[PDB]
């Protein structure tokens, strides 16, 4: 019986559904994992990719006997092609990794000393995308028709933030359209 945050999600558990998706690591060390969703191995060979779930790997970096590899789109030489397909298209945003904003925040707290130059370069190439997305959403909701919108590439964070007002601000106008007759 919370009665506090019931219609929506707090931002302390939208990260909880994305931490249970796997990425690739660089192992170091040599049964050990009977977690019922485990994929335990034997003596593990280094210099080899393996799709491991993220939350144990964050715990594995606390004891510091492994190293993460960045995903394939995490360089500044790669997001530059994203910022031109949108500047020519005020229609929508094209190509998104769908969980990007909650991914980088975990990947900067305690995952800063891993990749070659994330600091002073990547956060410039992120916060621009945090607003160019939301500049587009301000043009979007002014175009509100009846019971029909078109969102294509929206993050889990922004969909948790447009949510708690856009429901009842059109539900309240659903009365005067329907109950007129």
């Amino acid at each position: 019986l919370p009665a506090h945050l019931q219609q929506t999600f707090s931002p302390e558990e939208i990260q909880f559904i994305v931490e249970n998706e796997p990425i690739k690591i660089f192992p170091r060390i040599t049964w050990q994992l009977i977690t019922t969703d485990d994929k335990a191995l034997n003596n593990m060979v280094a210099m080899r990719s393996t799709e491991v779930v993220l939350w144990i790997a964050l715990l594995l970096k606390q004891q510091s006997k492994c190293s993460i590899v960045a995903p394939q789109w995490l360089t500044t030489k790669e997001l530059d092609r994203k910022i031109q397909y949108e500047k020519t298209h005020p229609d929508r945003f094209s190509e998104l990794p769908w969980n990007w904003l909650v991914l980088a925040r975990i990947l900067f707290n305690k995952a800063k000393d891993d990749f070659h130059d994330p600091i002073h370069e990547l956060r410039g190439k992120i916060q621009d995308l945090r607003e160019i997305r939301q500049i587009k959403v301000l043009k979007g909701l002014k175009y509100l028709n009846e019971s029909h919108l078109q969102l294509d590439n929206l993050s889990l964070l922004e969909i948790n933030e447009l949510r708690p007002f856009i429901t009842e601000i059109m539900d309240k106008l659903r009365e005067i359209h329907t109950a007129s007759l």
Partner: protein, 159 residues
């Protein structure tokens, strides 16, 4: 719904009058009220007393200052307007009006209003003499729970 907000919004008024003569007076002697007499009516009885007859007892006298004097004022510029000093609740009073009367004319004119008024309240939500806050009076439930959404979402996103 145990109606925590709207029965007080149904505690408001209407000026209206009669078609017959009844000795039921609680408003003071001379118990038969003479007909065609203007009487202030609360919402709860008068919503159904204009229903029970064929020809009902009461006469619906429209408070047409809610129908001509402000309908052009809300047509002009919905960025700063009295939604408030004329109705402490504009909304459900507009709802329960349009059920009994069913006029499709002003059914359009608030459908333009609410998206335009909310067009402030989204993009105004990023972070005084006797009555004069009242421009921001009938918006309190509307946006304040959305204000706590943007507040805490920064606080996880930062340290």
């Amino acid at each position: 719904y145990y109606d925590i907000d709207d029965v007080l919004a149904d505690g408001t008024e209407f000026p209206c009058k009669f078609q017959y003569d009844i000795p039921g007076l609680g408003y003071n002697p001379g118990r038969p009220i003479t007909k065609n007499t203007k009487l202030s009516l609360p919402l709860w009885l008068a919503r159904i007393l204009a229903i029970v007859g064929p020809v009902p007892f009461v006469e619906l006298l429209p408070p047409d200052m809610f129908s001509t004097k402000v309908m052009n004022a809300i047509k002009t510029d919905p960025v700063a307007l009295d939604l408030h000093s004329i109705n402490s609740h504009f909304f459900s009073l507009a709802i329960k009006w349009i059920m009994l009367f069913s006029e499709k004319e002003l059914a359009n004119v608030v459908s333009e209003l609410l998206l335009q008024r909310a067009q402030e309240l989204n993009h105004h939500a990023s972070s005084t003499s006797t009555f004069l806050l009242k421009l921001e009076e009938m918006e309190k439930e509307i946006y304040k729970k959305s204000h706590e959404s943007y507040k805490d979402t920064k606080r996880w996103m930062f340290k």
